């Protein structure tokens, strides 16, 4: 409770030397990129005045055509995270940077007498050209040094299955522009994977249902765990994940591949799925693809190319190129190769750059105890991870918005990582750290970055290239060229083993938290996991069949014992899941993540094996718990007969025969309450639920943009999550194998808004532009408006929801004290709500006002693509489309005329301003029934 007769004397500090580019009060977007798995995503970040505020996709980048990921969106909080490392630590004791260079260059001179024998490095699957080129200088200045690449989720099998089927290593580039039939076994390709944004848009661009569409992608998915690809999957099949490895062997025998030698008979329903898929891939041969996820063994990815090249997809859909990353022979096998070298004391200088393997170890590779058997073990990470607890040195991280580096996306399009801000704490990124090891410490990151690109630029001048490389970000001059392949057969000649019986633990990365490197990110943790709306919890998902067998509920706490190691995990029954198998999420139980992901339980990394690192059939469940919180946001996961108001579904079998087959013909509803005219801009939105794969990137995009506060798990279980936009899974019918549909629910900006007539002080009123205006300051916290809101979109700041993972909201001694590091990630044109103030999806008025005012200043009108809401230009699939409804040539008023257009709860005349499109899901004739 703050009170004063006068607000304090707010100061106005100008610059000391204002840059020629900073106009105070204007976004000034930059062009950088983010190493997700070594591959770039090509960002375009809002740099208000030196500091970044909001991360957006660079529309010129191939890995993100203007829309970002879920992790990639919330990585503006990972930077403005008060738990980020602020100074190097020598043996736990905080120390200076120049003290590290004194003891790092002294180790190089001790690693020079010996010909660089103990200078092992544990970076994680880097594709950066300037980091590769400094890896080259480090391995020739020290010839015996080795560089082990270990990413816990990266292409360990797909890169070892590419050279298992082709000889040398290749880097496949799947293209879904021309792909009528996708059959991706365990393929979570619309996932946080490096190609996840493009493979979500190129797959959505095939299922753009319009007034006259007749051909749509099919996407047969075959996956044990329900995933964000299974939403767009039209025939998803819950498989054990031990049958996938011989479910592709069955498809590679229907399609004619010579020596597959399939085995382990499939099923009555898994076989009917593999005949209908193969009979669908033999048709439209040139326009099809057979994807394979990462969980599968390398012999399956070898068959993924044995079928793709058999259907003639090479050169058309699947394109093999030079490997973008430096060495694809690293990963689980390179981590064990180094750990066996850290044992017996061969390693003397171990620079673990960003891998964090003390946490990410498969629990068979004993990296935790192999560490400290070395004399000097460095680390350069933005968080003091579980390695920094055990390593000697720990250099600060220099998060990618503060580091002068580069990336190389898929297909090789390098993007110069562009530091928006100078590092909040002295950064010393992976390039500024190898400069210490190479012997050039005082040479900054930007100096080596151009000292490498001046060599790689032979065409024309440099400042006409370097600044053009910095402006677009995309250099697109190092495009990974194609490579002729051979597909040497006989790789599947080895017979499949005897099928093992027992419950199977399938290891999966968490959609939101990929591999635990972002566990302290409160935004992508509060964000509900896609199918199970849990927020702050890692669970053991089971199908309803394989939990009624064990007598398990949605709240018990089982003890997953897989090959001797027990984990004591919760349980959450997931209807779409597969029989006799559980899944796990990678990256939750972190002893030293920070203050956010510090004790979110169930570290699933301590159950792997490094021989069965993605799925294994030796699990014993044996429940040892009774009750757990398991804060999930949704509540009821069933369409309780309320179709026509929730996500309406159909099929293309009955859409070509009747376009308006789910648009109910209703007369003009009588409305006593007047009628207002909006002759200005009529701001409306048209969501296409056919392509909403629950990526949850729009959930974080509304958090990064609208200063939405994180809530603790203790208050999300109470149903007090602040999320102006939410995606709703609904699980229609047949709880063993249910179809799942999304209706992304936000504030419909109702013209006859019932939530407005019910505010006593008249806080929430409508607009002359046509959108419900929530006024956070006139809100006295009556909270009645939500009770009148039919959709329950309005969220209420019950307690002082602000910096909540860093200060528990149930206190009030610090509720007026704000974290100074967090005050920068907040949008400078959205109100940071106090407690007792309701909020809702305001169509991003912070973007409508700043653009209308720029239009009225210039005496012109708003262009159709000028006002993109935060959730519209972040959705990879481009489901959300926002724009003027009065502008007749707009992509919304030409999108609200589709035969699938409907509004939620039209039985009560709210005149919702968002109008969802139905989910037409292209069922096969000979596979449905």
């Amino acid at each position: 409770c703050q009170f004063a007769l006068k607000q304090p004397q707010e100061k106005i500090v100008p610059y000391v030397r204002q840059p020629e580019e900073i106009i105070h009060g204007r976004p000034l977007f930059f062009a950088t990129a983010v190493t997700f798995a070594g591959f770039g995503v090509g960002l375009l970040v809002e740099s208000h005045e030196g500091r970044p505020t909001k991360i957006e996709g660079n529309p010129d980048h191939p890995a993100s055509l203007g829309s970002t990921d879920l992790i990639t969106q919330a990585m503006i909080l990972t930077m403005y995270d008060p738990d980020r490392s602020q100074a190097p630590t020598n043996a736990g004791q905080e120390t200076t940077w120049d003290a590290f260079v004194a003891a790092a260059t002294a180790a190089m001179q001790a690693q020079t007498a010996k010909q660089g024998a103990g200078l092992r490095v544990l970076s994680g699957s880097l594709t950066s050209p300037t980091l590769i080129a400094q890896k080259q200088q480090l391995l020739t200045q020290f010839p015996q040094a080795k560089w082990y690449e270990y990413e816990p989720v990266g292409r360990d099998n797909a890169n070892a299955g590419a050279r298992l089927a082709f000889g040398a290593d290749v880097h496949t580039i799947y293209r879904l522009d021309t792909a009528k039939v996708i059959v991706g076994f365990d393929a979570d390709f619309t996932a946080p994977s490096p190609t996840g944004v493009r493979m979500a848009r190129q797959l959505a661009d095939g299922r753009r249902i319009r007034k006259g569409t007749k051909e749509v992608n099919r996407l047969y998915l075959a996956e044990s765990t329900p995933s964000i690809t299974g939403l767009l999957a039209d025939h998803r099949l819950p498989v054990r994940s031990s049958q996938i490895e011989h479910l592709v062997r069955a498809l590679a025998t229907l399609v004619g591949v010579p020596n597959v030698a399939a085995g382990a008979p499939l099923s009555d329903t898994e076989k009917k799925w593999v005949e209908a898929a193969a009979k669908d891939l033999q048709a439209n041969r040139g326009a099809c693809v057979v994807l394979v996820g990462e969980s599968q063994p390398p012999v399956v990815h070898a068959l993924g190319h044995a079928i793709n090249a058999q259907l003639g997809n090479v050169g058309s859909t699947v394109v093999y190129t030079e490997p973008v990353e430096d060495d694809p022979s690293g990963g689980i096998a390179a981590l064990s190769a180094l750990t066996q070298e850290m044992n017996a004391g061969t390693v003397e200088v171990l620079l673990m750059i960003e891998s964090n393997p003390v946490y990410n170890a498969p629990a068979d590779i004993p990296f935790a105890e192999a560490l400290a058997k070395v004399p000097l073990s460095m680390h350069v990470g933005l968080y003091r991870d579980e390695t920094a607890q055990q390593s000697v040195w720990h250099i600060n991280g220099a998060h990618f918005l503060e580091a002068w580096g580069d990336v190389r996306a898929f297909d090789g399009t390098t993007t110069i990582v562009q530091p928006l801000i100078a590092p909040l704490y002295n950064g010393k990124s992976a390039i500024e750290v190898l400069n210490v090891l190479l012997g050039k410490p005082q040479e900054t990151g930007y100096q080596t970055l151009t000292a490498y690109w001046q060599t790689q630029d032979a065409s024309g001048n440099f400042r006409v290239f370097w600044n053009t490389a910095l402006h677009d970000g995309v250099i697109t001059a190092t495009q990974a060229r194609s490579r002729q392949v051979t597909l040497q057969q006989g790789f599947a000649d080895a017979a499949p083993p005897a099928p093992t019986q027992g419950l199977e633990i399938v290891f999966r990365p968490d959609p939101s938290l990929w591999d635990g490197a972002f566990a302290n990110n409160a935004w992508l943790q509060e964000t509900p996991k896609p199918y199970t709306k849990l927020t702050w919890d890692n669970v053991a998902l089971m199908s309803v069949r394989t939990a009624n067998a064990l007598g398990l509920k949605n709240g018990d706490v089982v003890r997953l014992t897989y090959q001797g190691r027990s984990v004591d995990a919760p349980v959450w029954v997931q209807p779409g899941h597969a029989d006799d198998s559980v899944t796990v999420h990678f990256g939750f139980g972190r002893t030293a993540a920070g203050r956010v992901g510090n004790n979110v339980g169930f570290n699933a990394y301590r159950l792997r094996t490094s021989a069965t690192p993605w799925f294994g059939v030796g699990l014993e469940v044996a429940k040892v718990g009774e009750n757990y919180k398991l804060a999930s946001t949704q509540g009821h996961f069933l369409m309780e007969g309320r179709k026509k108001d929730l996500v309406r579904y159909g099929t293309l079998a009955e859409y070509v025969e009747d376009e308006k087959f789910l648009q109910v013909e209703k007369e003009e509803p009588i409305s006593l309450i007047g009628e207002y005219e909006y002759n200005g801009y009529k701001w409306g939105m048209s969501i296409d639920l056919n392509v909403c794969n629950s990526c949850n990137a729009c959930v974080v995009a509304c958090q990064s943009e609208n200063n939405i506060p994180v809530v603790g798990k203790d208050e999300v279980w109470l149903g007090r999550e602040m999320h102006w936009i939410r995606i709703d899974q609904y699980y229609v019918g047949d709880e063993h194998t249910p179809n799942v549909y999304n209706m992304v629910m936000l504030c419909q900006q109702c013209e006859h808004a019932p939530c407005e007539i019910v505010c006593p002080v008249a806080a929430t009123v409508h607009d002359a532009e046509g959108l419900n205006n929530m006024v956070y300051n006139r809100c006295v916290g009556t909270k009645y408006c939500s009770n009148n809101c039919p959709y329950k979109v309005r969220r209420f700041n019950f307690l002082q929801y602000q910096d909540v993972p860093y200060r528990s909201p149930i206190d009030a001694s610090t509720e007026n004290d704000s974290i100074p590091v967090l005050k920068m990630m907040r949008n400078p044109d959205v109100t940071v709500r106090a407690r007792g103030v309701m909020e809702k999806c305001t169509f991003c008025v912070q973007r409508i006002n700043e653009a209308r005012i720029q239009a009225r200043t210039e005496n012109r009108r708003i262009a159709d693509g000028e006002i993109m809401t935060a959730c519209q230009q972040v959705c990879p699939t481009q489901a959300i489309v926002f724009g003027d409804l009065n502008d007749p040539q707009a992509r919304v008023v030409d999108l609200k005329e589709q035969p699938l257009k409907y509004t939620s709860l039209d039985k009560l005349n709210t005149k919702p301003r968002v109008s969802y499109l139905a989910k037409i899901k292209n069922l096969n004739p000979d596979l449905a029934e």
Binding site: Q634, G635, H636, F637, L638, M639, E640, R642, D645, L646, G719, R726, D728, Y730, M743, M745, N787, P790, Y791, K792, S904, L905
Partner: protein, 52 residues
């Protein structure tokens, strides 16, 4: 209805206890039992009342 249970004050005091509690549950049925399960099944809460 019956004067046997109205003139007898121990019954009129027990029925009044049963109404004050009963007419509190009417205000719970009207408010919470109708709010926690409404339109949009993805917005179904429970409201276990806290100690405060």
């Amino acid at each position: 209805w019956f004067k046997r249970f109205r003139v007898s004050l121990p019954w009129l005091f027990f029925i009044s206890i049963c109404i004050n509690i009963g007419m509190w549950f009417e205000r719970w049925v009207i408010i919470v039992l109708s709010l926690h399960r409404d339109f949009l099944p993805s917005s179904w809460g429970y409201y276990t009342p806290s100690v405060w």
